[PDB]
Amino acid sequence: MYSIEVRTHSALHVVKGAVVKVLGSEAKWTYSTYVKGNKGVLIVKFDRKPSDEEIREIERLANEKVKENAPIKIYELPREEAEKMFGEDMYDLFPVPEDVRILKVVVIEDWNVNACNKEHTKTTGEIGPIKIRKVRFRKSKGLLEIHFELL
Ligand SMILES: [Zn+2]
């Protein structure tokens, strides 16, 4: 089976996709992410605190993607090829340093594309129900934190 950490990290990709679907391209750049147990935190560059409605919709879409049990594809490509294939969208706010010449790219079709070297579940269904616990907007820094728990 997959550890709760691997499942929670995989959830970050699902939640990020939902975030972009609801908030739009203005929220496409991830500042950072981290997992501790069954708790995951996604921080993206954004300019406002979403409404409770928007937060609920992000949660709904995330769970719906998990329910769809879509495959989580992993691409291991030379950096140059990865860029031609996925473009800038595969990067986070801070692009992978140039000394890294081979990239592993995670892909959830029409949902999320991200250069990531961590371990993931094979499908989104293996993640399980997700619950957003806290959302915090840091105005000065222009960062939106989404704290969730994998039930
Ligand atoms: Zn990942």
From Swiss-Prot:
Cofactor note: Binds 1 zinc ion per subunit; the homodimer seems not to bind zinc. The zinc is probably not catalytic. Another report suggests the zinc is catalytic.
Gene coding for it: alaXS
Keyword Zinc: yes
Organism: Pyrococcus horikoshii (strain ATCC 700860 / DSM 12428 / JCM 9974 / NBRC 100139 / OT-3)
Protein name stated in the entry: Alanyl-tRNA editing protein AlaX-S
A Pfam family assignment: tRNA_SAD
GO molecular function per UniProt: aminoacyl-tRNA deacylase activity; aminoacyl-tRNA ligase activity; ATP binding; metal ion binding
GO cellular component labels: cytoplasm
Binding site for Zn(2+): H9, H13, C116, H120
